[PDB]
């Protein structure tokens, strides 16, 4: 491992290199400026980002001794010998040379003093404080500490003079992902038909290790087709398939469609794939949505040239059965950004604090796998008015809303977190969410027009065998006040009548055989629509339509 | 045990077998490709699916060293002894030969390290992290883990290098259950009458061990039929198909064992009148579950929900009982106000749990009696309990229509006040057909009278046409 | 007994279960009776402690894991089964749940006859009428 | 006493009850008196916390289980029996629930006569009339 292994964060790499070499390579400039260089440095960030790799690389280029201390391996069996073990390790590290010391998993020895309730841990942490303090200027030894989460650190360890400089090893950008891909793919037999730029342009939230997972998965897939064709039979080995081996692009596509970022698998969503042709109608609305979602994620230079802060939230409102959840599905599957699905009441919990912890965790993952699109469906469940009634049942709902506002208002151009809102009753939405600067643009989804409705019918009956001589414009003109859900219901009833006809025809055929084509016609007939129209209704009453119209007017 | 024991999951058998054997049979090929194979895998799914069975099969077939770690076994009382045990285990596995570690019930030893408040557990998980990755992480060894709640693991442990590949050993399909039955009936002696295909079709939610239990119960029934010891009876047992029918009619899937309904005995002939509604219900329930090829031929998902509404006692709960008793799909009978709780969020937690059971043991039918009790209008109540009812109805809306899979859940609602239902529930997609159940007419009243008098002796000359003509506004209850 | 197995030291309750099962398997084809099991088998999802969850996982792996059990049968008794981990309510661990419910008139007569067979009754007492007039008695 | 058996550590209250009952059964036929049983016998399923459920189950096992008791008698005292676990209010655990309620005029007269046996009175003192005016005074 070397300087060419760690990748992405070039400026951070330069900063850490300066920090670790200069007080060990050239201390004359430190004396000239007049500052004593620090002895401890922290690096933090999401797990699997490259912290340990960078520390090992630093231990490699510099010939200074590298003493790794596994966090959970510092205790001992006999009463009070772990302290002696740590002390003798540290004294050998100092006495031997101006070495480099790496303490892994500091969190194991930093439980914030509140959830400790022990005494051996207290003794070990205090011993570490004394050993860290007892570092003379002549030692010329510096410690690098590795923490998975930054907020579980003892501030006593964070005080100046012991551990002062932290570095947020964050998510590499597109160039960082491309270069790390090159680093991993340079030691492989790569076929010519490869474009790593596309892979480093379609991968968004991946950080450090999942790229390696991607590579391994692709290699495995290649092994799959070459094993299926070779058919070694598990009784010998040949010597021609190995040299006739080339990694394709379709395997990379398969790996991309298979794996997801290592952080978001805890919230993996079941694969439902809906194309932009599934959302019939709403052409201008879909165009506006595309413009709103593609610009912040692809044109930062345009954003700078405009000089206007883009909105970082949006609210869909309208009558039930119009397609809000459908647009959410379409964005989730083919928007080219991460997506975490959450249900409103799902997060709330009966214990004290757990609810706010859940909001904090979901938004932490959202910021980690940036860019992302957090879909809040049925927003009126968690975001209601505040102080509506004296009986606030402990004010937990108010506390949750305050947590959502305080932890969502800490946004900026960075982290690219786009919030999709979706509510059925906008009247109960809190005005705090609706104030300008937080969720400004509002999209009202109206009832479909006759043309839009014909498009909806064609989009719902796309993958359905249908008669040659049949039209849908009559149905569209007839179902004047219908909604998308109603159109789904009518087509479903027609299909149900068709399957009934098919099964009765098959039963009659079997009977006459007892005493080839499966049905008299595999396609849905016009008569099925004709006699499936007697049972449809209209989803939303005129009162609900009037209320939504008034809300749009105001 | 071998590869002929684990049944119903071809993909998972192939994935685990290749991952465990191919890097330990042709390492040169993986040096030729250049990269190392995945080396840690976590098997997850509902209990009684075959995770431990797969581990046993791998241990028996592969000739390499195998070390087994039950979860709590590592911990000990003396300070810093659990980590010593883990280090000793890893060293023993590595030193002798290339080996396979198997950690059963990892949830006991790998908490989230964020909600826990102990000390020893957090050091044991940190020690596991260091052993799985770091300086001198691991050589020529593979790690398999088994769990029932993959979400109860700290995410830092489930990254590449520790557990890169996730195999999902879930509920089987009809073909999977048929294959499992064929495996489990390979050693007993069966009569010719048994037909496993129909039995697998009717086993709508059984997973793994459930099938084994069914077989055992059938055999026991056969044992207690020909025991009312000489070799004459020791030979010629002959597990009949009737034994299997009885055991299937007695057992229920373990998933729904929590919410097993009391055995009420009604039949379709008990429901007088409403012939067309009865046929409609038959058509809407039995077609998606028995004839999926035609639905996929047309490329449309089936209709699921239905709502009965009408005057009290017209026969709504009677239809629900008939569905519960004379339908192959599983039944979840749920009360209206039973699911509410005094705590904060426990109503929606219970609703989510109920629907999780329904979607787990699919195809399933859930009966919502008095839908107007929990699903009322939204925001009408001024003085409320913090909008708990509002959150309940929103939870129902998202659970019945959201980011779900829409595999097979049939919701039937029964309320006599259809004006108090939230209009967001009445739209197609959740409760898409509303069936009015009107008061019986004369030909329905006569049918009802015969329906309830089919087990009663009557005078031969007693004609019921006069009674039917005499009751005009009456209902079935009357 | 239900709560009798757990001790304050970390990692000793599971050791007690290990010892119990190992003795049962080492001695003979045995029967293990666990009384009031609801106290050592919660759902691991509503509980928040650590020793209880770990004990539950120990029980699951000890009754059904690799080389699970050899000719030893497990009996359990509880007053409420719904507060038990679903992973324990499965074939292999708890094969079948018997419902010992409220006796009917004949059951009450049998209970009365067995319980009044060692005392010196008078000649004027019949037990069928007494079993008829006693209605909701659980035995 | 109620809170005197509980301890901080997990799995020690039950040890306290075990040793207490063992001491009771070690030597002679013994009488146990648990004052304020409602403080350590809550209604199961109505409480949040495994320790209360465990101590309730341990008490149930101790009083009525396999080889339950030998010539040992148990007495409890509570103010609100309705808050006691119903499994505890069965024959074999708490079979005779005696109601020590408000005395009547005669009982309160007895109370006055016993209380004024060590006190020095005046010649012109009667307790029957004094007992008559008091109505609700208990003990």
């Amino acid at each position: 491992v070397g300087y060419d292994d760690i990748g992405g964060c070039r400026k951070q790499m330069a900063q850490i290199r300066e920090m670790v070499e200069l007080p060990l390579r050239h201390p004359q400039l430190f004396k000239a400026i007049g500052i004593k260089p620090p002895r401890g440095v922290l690096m933090y960030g999401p797990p699997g980002t490259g912290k340990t790799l960078m520390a090992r690389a630093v231990a490699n280029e510099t010939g200074a001794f590298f003493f790794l201390i596994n966090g959970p391996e510092v205790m001992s069996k006999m009463a009070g010998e772990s302290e002696s073990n740590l002390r003798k390790a540290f004294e050998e590290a100092e006495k031997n040379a101006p070495a480099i010391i790496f303490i892994d998993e500091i969190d194991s020895i930093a439980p914030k003093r509140d959830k400790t309730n022990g005494e051996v841990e207290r003794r070990v942490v205090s011993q570490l404080l004394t050993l860290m303090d007892g570092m003379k200027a002549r030692s010329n030894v510096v410690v690098i500490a590795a923490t998975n989460r930054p907020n579980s650190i003892d501030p006593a360890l964070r005080r100046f003079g012991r551990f002062d400089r932290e570095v947020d090893i964050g998510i590499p950008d597109a160039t960082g992902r491309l270069e790390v891909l090159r680093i991993h793919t340079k030691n492989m037999k790569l076929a010519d038909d490869v474009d790593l730029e596309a892979l480093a342009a379609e991968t968004h939230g991946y950080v450090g290790a999942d790229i390696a997972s991607l590579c391994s998965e692709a290699a495995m897939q290649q092994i799959r087709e070459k094993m299926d064709l070779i058919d070694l039979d598990e009784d010998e080995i040949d010597a021609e398939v190995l040299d006739s081996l080339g990694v394709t692009m379709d395997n990379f596509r398969f790996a991309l469609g298979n794996s997801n970022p290592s952080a978001l698998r805890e919230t993996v969503v079941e694969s439902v794939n809906v194309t932009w042709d599934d959302v019939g109608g709403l052409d201008e609305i879909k165009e506006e949505l595309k413009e709103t979602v593609e610009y912040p994620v692809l044109h930062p230079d345009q954003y700078t040239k405009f000089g206007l802060s883009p909105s970082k939230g949006v609210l869909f409102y309208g009558p039930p059965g119009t397609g809000k959840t459908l647009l959410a599905k379409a964005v989730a599957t083919e928007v080219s950004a991460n997506f975490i699905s959450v249900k409103g009441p799902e997060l709330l919990s009966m214990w004290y604090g757990e609810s706010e912890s859940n909001i904090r965790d979901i938004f932490d993952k959202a910021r980690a796998a940036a860019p992302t699109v957090v879909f809040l469906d049925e927003l009126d469940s968690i975001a209601k008015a505040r102080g509506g009634s004296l009986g606030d049942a402990g004010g937990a709902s108010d506390r949750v809303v305050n947590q959502l506002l305080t932890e969502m208002d800490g946004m900026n151009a960075k982290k690219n977190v786009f919030v999709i809102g979706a509510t059925n009753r906008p009247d109960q939405i809190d005005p705090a969410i609706l104030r300008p600067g937080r969720l400004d643009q509002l999209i009202y989804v109206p009832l479909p027009d006759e043309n839009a409705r014909l498009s909806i019918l064609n989009a719902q009956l796309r993958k359905t065998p249908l008669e040659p001589g049949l039209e849908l414009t009559a149905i569209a003109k007839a179902t004047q006040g219908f909604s998308g859900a109603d159109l789904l219901y009518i087509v479903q009833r027609a299909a149900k009548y068709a399957i009934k006809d098919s099964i009765e025809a098959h039963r009659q055929h079997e009977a006459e055989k007892e005493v080839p084509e499966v049905d008299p016609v595999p396609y849905i007939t016009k008569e099925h629509f004709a006699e499936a129209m007697k049972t449809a209704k209209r989803s939303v009453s005129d009162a609900e339509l009037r209320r939504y119209e008034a809300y749009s007017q105001q | 045990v071998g590869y002929d024991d684990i049944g119903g999951c071809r993909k998972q058998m192939a994935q685990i077998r290749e991952m465990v054997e191919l890097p330990l049979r042709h390492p040169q090929l993986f040096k030729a490709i250049g990269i190392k194979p995945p080396r840690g895998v976590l098997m997850y799914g509902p209990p009684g699916t075959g995770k431990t069975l797969m581990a046993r099969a791998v241990a028996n077939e592969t000739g390499a060293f195998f070390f087994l770690i039950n979860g709590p076994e590592v911990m000990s009382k003396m300070a810093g002894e659990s980590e010593s045990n883990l280090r000793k285990a890893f060293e023993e596995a590595e030193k002798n030969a290339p080996a396979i570690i198997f950690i059963d019930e990892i949830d006991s030893i790998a908490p989230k390290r964020d909600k826990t408040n102990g000390e020893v557990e957090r050091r044991v998980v940190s020690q596991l992290l260091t052993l799985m990755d770091g300086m001198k992480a691991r050589s020529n060894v593979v790690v398999i883990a088994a769990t029932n709640r993959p979400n109860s693991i700290d995410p830092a442990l489930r990254r590449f290098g520790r557990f890169d590949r996730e195999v999902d050993i879930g509920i089987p399909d009809a073909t999977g259950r048929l294959e499992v039955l064929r495996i489990h009936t390979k050693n007993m002696k069966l009569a010719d009458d048994v037909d496993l295909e129909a039995l697998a079709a009717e086993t709508h939610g059984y997973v793994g061990a459930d099938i084994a239990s069914l077989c055992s119960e059938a055999a026991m029934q056969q044992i207690r039929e020909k025991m009312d010891i000489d070799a004459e009876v020791l030979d010629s047992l002959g597990v009949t198909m009737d034994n299997f029918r009885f055991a299937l009619g007695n057992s229920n899937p373990s998933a729904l064992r929590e919410t097993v309904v009391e055995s009420v005995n009604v039949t379709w002939d008990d429901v007088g009148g409403l012939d067309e509604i009865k046929e409609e219900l038959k058509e809407t329930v039995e077609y998606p579950v028995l004839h999926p090829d035609q639905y996929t031929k047309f490329g449309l998902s089936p209709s699921k929900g239905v709502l009965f509404y009408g005057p009290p006692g017209t026969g709504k709960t009677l239809l629900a009982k008939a569905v519960a008793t004379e339908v192959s799909a599983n039944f979840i009978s749920v009360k209206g106000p039973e699911l509410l709780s005094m705590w904060y969020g426990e109503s929606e937690s219970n609703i989510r749990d109920i629907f999780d059971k329904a979607r787990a043991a699919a195809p399933t039918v859930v009966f919502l009696d008095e839908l107007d009790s929990i699903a009322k209008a939204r925001g009408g109540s001024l003085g409320d309990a913090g909008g708990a009812s509002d959150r309940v109805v929103n939870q129902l809306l998202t659970e019945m229509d959201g980011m779900n899979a829409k595999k097979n859940v049939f919701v039937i609602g029964a309320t006599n006040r259809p004006d108090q239902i939230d209009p967001a529930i009445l739209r197609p997609g959740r409760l898409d057909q509303l069936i009015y159940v009107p008061l019986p007419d004369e030909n329905a009243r006569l049918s009802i009278l015969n329906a309830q008098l089919r087990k009663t002796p009557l005078e031969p000359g007693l004609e019921l046409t006069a009674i039917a003509k005499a009751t005009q506004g009456f209902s079935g209850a009357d | 007994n239900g709560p009798e197995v757990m001790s304050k030291m970390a990692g000793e309750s599971e050791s007690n279960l290990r010892k119990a099962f190992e003795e049962a398997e080492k001695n003979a084809p045995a029967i293990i009776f666990i009384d009031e099991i609801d106290s050592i088998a919660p759902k691991r999802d509503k509980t928040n402690g650590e020793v209880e969850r770990r004990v539950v996982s120990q029980l699951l792996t000890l009754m059904d894991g690799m080389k699970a059990r050899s000719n030893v049968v497990v009996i359990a008794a509880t007053n409420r089964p719904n507060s038990i981990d679903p992973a324990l309510r499965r074939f292999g661990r708890f094969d079948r749940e018997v419902d010992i419910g409220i006796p009917d008139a004949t059951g009450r007569l049998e209970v009365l006859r067995i319980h009044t067979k060692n005392m010196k009754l008078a000649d004027d007492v019949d037990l069928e009428a007494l079993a008829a007039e006693t209605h909701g008695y659980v035995g | 006493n109620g809170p005197e058996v509980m301890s901080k550590m997990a799995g020690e209250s039950e040890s306290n009850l075990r040793k207490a009952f063992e001491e009771a059964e070690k030597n002679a036929p013994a009488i146990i008196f648990i004052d304020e049983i409602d403080s350590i016998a809550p209604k199961r399923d109505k409480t949040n916390g495994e320790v209360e459920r465990r101590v309730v189950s341990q008490l149930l096992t101790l009083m009525d289980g396999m080889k339950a008791r030998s010539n040992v008698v148990v007495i409890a005292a509570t103010n609100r029996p309705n808050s006691i676990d119903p499994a505890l209010r069965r024959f074999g655990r708490f079979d005779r629930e005696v109601d020590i309620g408000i005395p009547d005029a005669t009982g309160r007269l007895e109370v006055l006569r016993i209380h004024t046996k060590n006190m020095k009175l005046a010649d012109d003192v009667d307790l029957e009339a004094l007992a008559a005016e008091t109505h609700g005074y208990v003990g």
Partner: peptide, 23 residues
């Protein structure tokens, strides 16, 4: 020699109440 010890203390929940209005 030293030894460890386990401890599980308690938890605290939140309830929900219903109120009555007078129009």
């Amino acid at each position: 020699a030293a030894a460890a010890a386990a401890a599980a203390a308690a938890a605290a929940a939140v309830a929900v109440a219903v109120a009555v209005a007078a129009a």
